Symmetry: C3
Subunit: 84 residues, 3 copies
């Protein structure tokens, strides 16, 4: 009744959320390749000083990439959203 309408709508909304999370993941992973190429550029420019972090006398930041979790999780979600 009103029940079915709501259940259908939730299904739709979960799929929209899956899609947005997956879109964010590709965007984030793409950007990360830009960022790491930038880093390689800076280690080149700072070659005589030991590289970027050595030049800054800072602890070196690395990209801790947790997006495998996202891809595996969202793929499982898409598979289950074939239940209605």
């Amino acid at each position: 009744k009103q029940f079915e309408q709501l259940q259908a709508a939730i299904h739709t909304d979960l799929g929209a959320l899956e899609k947005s999370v997956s879109a964010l993941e590709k965007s984030l992973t793409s950007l990360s390749e830009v960022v790491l190429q930038n880093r390689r550029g800076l280690d080149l420019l700072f070659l005589k000083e030991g590289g970027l972090c050595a030049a800054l006398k800072e602890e070196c930041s690395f990209y801790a990439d947790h997006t495998g979790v996202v891809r595996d999780s969202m793929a499982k979600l898409r598979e289950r959203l074939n239940q209605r």
Copy 2:
């Protein structure tokens, strides 16, 4: 019944996920502006070598931005949440 409580809970949880997806979108878009300005900086620094990617001798990485889909879908989702809570309250 218990069903009413659960309408309420799901509305809450979807709204929370919507808000969180949007916050992340805004943060990622903002970060990308920093990143691309960094890139222009490196392209200037390596201007004589034909740019960053040329100097690195690398295929050039570009930001595949899908955040437009995200901004659209989440606006739609807020609209739906609001419309459903409005009808329910009616």
Copy 3:
């Protein structure tokens, strides 16, 4: 019906953890980026930094991830309760 609510539950849990994973990753990347930035500010120090040398308004990171952290934490709580 219990089967339905279980399916929704699992789906919401998957989304929560995925959002949280993205959050950890974005926050980590952002540190790499900011450090890159500090690097470019040193390379352009006499010209007033990167932005001045590009003749541009400066981009800064508007970090909204605290909202994501707080909000997902509560979602995990409400999900675990049920």
